[PDB]
Design a protein around this ligand. Sequence first.
Ligand code: HEM
Ligand SMILES: *[C@@H]1O[C@H](CO)[C@@H](O[C@@H]2O[C@H](CO)[C@@H](O[C@@H]3O[C@H](CO)[C@@H](O)[C@H](O)[C@@H]3O)[C@H](O)[C@H]2NC(C)=O)[C@H](O)[C@H]1NC(C)=O
Ligand SMILES: *[C@@H]1O[C@H](CO)[C@@H](O[C@@H]2O[C@H](CO)[C@@H](O[C@H]3O[C@H](CO)[C@@H](O)[C@H](O)[C@@H]3O)[C@H](O)[C@H]2NC(C)=O)[C@H](O)[C@H]1NC(C)=O
Ligand SMILES: *[C@@H]1O[C@H](CO)[C@@H](O[C@@H]2O[C@H](CO)[C@@H](O[C@H]3O[C@H](CO)[C@@H](O)[C@H](O)[C@@H]3O)[C@H](O)[C@H]2NC(C)=O)[C@H](O)[C@H]1NC(C)=O
Ligand SMILES: *[C@@H]1O[C@H](CO)[C@@H](O[C@@H]2O[C@H](CO)[C@@H](O)[C@H](O)[C@H]2NC(C)=O)[C@H](O)[C@H]1NC(C)=O
Ligand SMILES: [C-]#N
Ligand SMILES: [Ca+2]
Length: 595
Amino acid sequence: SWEVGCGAPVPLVTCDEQSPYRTITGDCNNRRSPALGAANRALARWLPAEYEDGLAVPFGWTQRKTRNGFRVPLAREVSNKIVGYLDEEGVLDQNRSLLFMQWGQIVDHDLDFAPETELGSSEHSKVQCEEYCVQGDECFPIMFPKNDPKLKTQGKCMPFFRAGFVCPTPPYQSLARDQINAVTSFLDASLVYGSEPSLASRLRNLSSPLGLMAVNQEAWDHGLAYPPFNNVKPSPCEFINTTAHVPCFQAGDSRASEQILLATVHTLLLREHNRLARELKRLNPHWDGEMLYQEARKILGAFIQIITFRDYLPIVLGSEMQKWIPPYQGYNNSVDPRISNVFTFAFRFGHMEVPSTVSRLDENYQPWGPEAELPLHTLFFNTWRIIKDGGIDPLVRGLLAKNSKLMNQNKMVTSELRNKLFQPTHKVHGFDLAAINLQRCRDHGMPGYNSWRGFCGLSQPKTLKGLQAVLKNKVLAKKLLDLYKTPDNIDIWIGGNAEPMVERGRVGPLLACLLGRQFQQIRDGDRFWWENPGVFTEKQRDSLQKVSFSRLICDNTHITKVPLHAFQANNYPHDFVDCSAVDKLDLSPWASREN
Ligand code: HEM
Ligand SMILES: *[C@@H]1O[C@H](CO)[C@@H](O[C@@H]2O[C@H](CO)[C@@H](O[C@@H]3O[C@H](CO)[C@@H](O)[C@H](O)[C@@H]3O)[C@H](O)[C@H]2NC(C)=O)[C@H](O)[C@H]1NC(C)=O
Ligand SMILES: *[C@@H]1O[C@H](CO)[C@@H](O[C@@H]2O[C@H](CO)[C@@H](O[C@H]3O[C@H](CO)[C@@H](O)[C@H](O)[C@@H]3O)[C@H](O)[C@H]2NC(C)=O)[C@H](O)[C@H]1NC(C)=O
Ligand SMILES: *[C@@H]1O[C@H](CO)[C@@H](O[C@@H]2O[C@H](CO)[C@@H](O[C@H]3O[C@H](CO)[C@@H](O)[C@H](O)[C@@H]3O)[C@H](O)[C@H]2NC(C)=O)[C@H](O)[C@H]1NC(C)=O
Ligand SMILES: *[C@@H]1O[C@H](CO)[C@@H](O[C@@H]2O[C@H](CO)[C@@H](O)[C@H](O)[C@H]2NC(C)=O)[C@H](O)[C@H]1NC(C)=O
Ligand SMILES: [C-]#N
Ligand SMILES: [Ca+2]
């Protein structure tokens, strides 16, 4: 191999060795190997990278060069021919709330982020990629095929910059390109507390010794908090309505404002922290701020794991859950906690669960005003609809009352995502998330579909008839091969999502496998898992088993009617109960009795 230790912005420090608290960076989780699982290191590889030049050039870069003998089809074309649909009727998941979608994006943002290459602060490279669609260094444009309506209207391509890689970020050359993960691999609520020490400090309110998180001083939501505005300008959130001039929210993660519902749950998590921090002061008045913040931070993270593994994963993986995530047996120092590259694509199954509209409901769960129901596209980087149009209560009710989009082989990704995506850097509402994913798959050097089928010990179709049988769909199998020419070349993202769903889950055989393995590893390899003996006490754990998202809603909003089981489609009011019927989190076990 080569250089068993490359790396940059890898910061400060080494282990307090006996501290009861996680680092912010993720360091010191594992003792023998302290960097394992930290932020700003390469995504792990379960299989060797597959580039056009075996080193870094993505398949589809140089156009005389084929992959296994054939030209790779354009990203946008695979989007246009296989991913899109018009009829939004009957596309909803009859047994999964919109919260099911939303929680996936959170967990996801807790685990991974491969940021786009920068080297662009007063640059025209950003422009050479935007204005001329010139493929070059880090610019790897998504061209439009002939007859694409976007030609007549936007340009010749959609800009697109490659993701960042390890040793440097400028050119480089020596070995195989590995993409960076800028967040910690552990399910540790980093999307709330940050993954950098610098950032994590800024988010805190270090004026009062109460272990609180910095909150907004310009706007309030019925006496309830809002995360602070981010003051970098230009601001994406400002651009979408210059008259309101409302900036994006500032949070542990940089994506918090990407879409209105993600910002919403970001606020719930911010509010639960401060809530905990002051409930913990009540009980332990001697405690100093640092201890409040840290104990609060520990409880909250405990919260995100419990919800994720008890309530979310079982209805995603389904009958495939037990196969991959057997019951807990304690921490295993030999297990690699790092998020694999391919995961960052397998976990994108969620993109096909995002419905076309977002609704605001009143106190009786009725349409909130004349413009209650909004197009998803008008909500990307939209924070003014929250601050200036209702607060989060109308949105939380939407989450609870409305359905997610069911994945459908004939209706994959909604046009609001496939045709009208807003990107922070740019100005237009016309990017394609489906096309970007596909392009990105090649950017990261993903192996194909069959290499992954194999990895997981499933069959590897080689023929139109073979794919037919796997996909249980003739027309899909036919469209897929007309474009890819062989099942070997199909991109992991679309290839994985095209499979029929497993019994009682929301993904198929190949996806269940990739997702399962990863989640089994972050749990078995995390020294601070909430169930691991020593982290919490008998008594503390016992109380933690009682948490639920419904409760999270009750303590932190003015919604008084909620479902018991928030992840499944619930109807109002039959399925809704009073918050007073919902198990609370008993923090008595956190009291420290003296002398
Ligand atoms: C708008 C977007 C969403 C909803 C309205 C949305 C939703 C999800 C869900 C529900 C996911 C999982 C259950 C999920 C996973 C991942 N996404 Fe993501 N998403 C919206 C928009 C975007 C955009 C834009 C990107 C950037 C893609 C790129 O490569 O440039 C994006 C990415 C991802 C992603 C990769 C994260 C990473 O490792 O960098 C997921 C794992 N989503 N989305
Ligand atoms: C940009 O953002 C502003 C919000 O700052 C949006 O303006 C809002 O527009 C509506 C009407 O178009 C105003 O509401 C009106 O009055 C009452 C509500 O009290 C209602 O009953 C009426 O039917 C009507 O809807 C609202 O007050 C106004 N907000 C302000 C203070 O300007 C605007 O629509 C956004 N424009 C863009 C570019 O999206
Ligand atoms: C909508 O999704 C619901 C959420 O998963 C689902 O509820 C699930 O119902 C089954 C009932 O069979 C439960 O699974 C267990 O049931 C019994 C225990 O009574 C066991 O003997 C079984 O082996 C199995 O372990 C789940 O507990 C329950 N899921 C959750 C998370 O609550 C509904 O059935 C779905 N509704 C429709 C219409 O399909
Ligand atoms: C850091 O922590 C500070 C201490 O909690 C916090 O200051 C407090 O801010 C609240 C809310 O803005 C104020 O409480 C309320 O005051 C009257 C009620 O008497 C209301 O009319 C207000 O609207 C408000 O809800 C307190 O006045 C204030 N506490 C003190 C003693 O100054 C800071 O806001 C926190 N800083 C950040 C950036 O989050
Ligand atoms: C911790 O997990 C590891 C990793 O799976 C397990 O290690 C296995 O150990 C056996 C010998 O006992 C070897 O044959 C395999 O190489 C390992 N499994 C694989 C495929 O990685 C181990 O079971 C766990 N250790 C403890 C103490 O629970
Ligand atoms: C994710 N966006
Ligand atoms: Ca994390």
